[PDB]
């Protein structure tokens, strides 16, 4: 049933590919953002020594737009084995010391890219997040959330759950669920998130608490299952929680929704054990 359509930028990206390096390099200084990014994407794809060097130099430019673009390119472009450490160090440093929060955010995302391709950088990514997770910029903290997920960081994760930004909290919780991290602190933060103003965050807290079999989610779970429009994840969490208190309502829902298979699944799980 599900499908997907090609990105709206793809067309423009293919046009950029027809251009030579010299032309792409110039486009990095275009006034349009999308134009700069598209060009850089082509550079990350074909990127050779001339593109790597230029990216590095851009990393030291007075214009933060060039620094951002250089660090972006550097996160995915191929680089010789003898320049890899230096590029990583260049990104790590910007992530921590660039005067532009935009640059810092991009650089952290680029150090993440590089680590995934070569895990030797993990230890450094951790030390890096130990300070960047506390940056004053939300973009930076957000990028830090992404970074951490690429690789304890638990304590950092916990502080991000308490972030003023909803997007940051969602990513933290999201990565905690992904790694199945669990302790009294995370559970308590999830219980509190049941009252988060951000629907997306409440959902991750609900699935997180249910996988953990923590009955403090019961009340909210019950409320969510009684809605006219219900979230599939909620129904699924209901089965994961393993508390038979939810059987009655699940049974009721069977006659409420045309496709109640997912409901039956949750019911099957409950009746077990």
UniProtKB/Swiss-Prot annotation:
It holds the Pfam family HEAT_2. One of its GO terms (molecular function) is oxidoreductase activity. SUPFAM superfamilies: ARM repeat. Transmembrane segments: none annotated. PANTHER family: DEOXYHYPUSINE HYDROXYLASE, PBS LYASE HEAT-LIKE PROTEIN. This is Protein YibA. The gene is yibA.
């Amino acid at each position: 049933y599900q499908k997907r359509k090609a990105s709206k930028e793809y067309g423009l990206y293919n046009q950029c590919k027809k251009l030579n390096d010299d032309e792409l390099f110039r486009l990095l200084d275009d006034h349009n953002s999308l134009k700069r990014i598209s060009s850089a994407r082509v550079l990350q794809l074909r990127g050779g020594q001339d593109a790597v060097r230029l990216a590095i130099e851009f990393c030291s430019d007075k214009n933060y737009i060039r620094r951002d673009i250089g660090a972006f390119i550097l996160g995915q472009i191929k680089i010789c084995k003898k320049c890899e450490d230096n590029v990583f160090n260049i990104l790590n440093n910007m992530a921590l010391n660039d005067k532009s929060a935009c640059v810092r955010a991009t650089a952290i995302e680029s150090t993440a890219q590089r680590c995934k391709k070569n895990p030797i950088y993990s230890p450094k990514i951790v030390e890096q997040s130990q300070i960047t997770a506390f940056d004053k910029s939300t973009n930076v903290r957000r990028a830090t959330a992404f970074a951490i997920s690429v690789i304890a960081t638990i304590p950092l994760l916990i502080n991000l759950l308490k972030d003023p930004n909803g997007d940051v909290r969602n990513w933290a919780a999201f990565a905690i669920n992904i790694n199945k991290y669990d302790n009294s602190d995370i559970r308590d933060c999830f219980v509190e998130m049941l009252q988060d103003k951000n629907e997306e965050v409440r959902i991750e807290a609900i699935i997180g608490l249910s996988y953990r079999k923590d009955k403090r989610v019961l009340s909210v779970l019950c409320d969510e299952l009684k809605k006219n429009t219900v979230y599939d994840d909620i129904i699924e969490a209901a089965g994961e929680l393993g508390d038979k208190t939810l059987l009655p309502v699940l049974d009721t829902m069977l006659y409420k929704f045309d496709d109640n298979e997912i409901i039956t699944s949750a019911i099957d799980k409950l009746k077990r054990s």
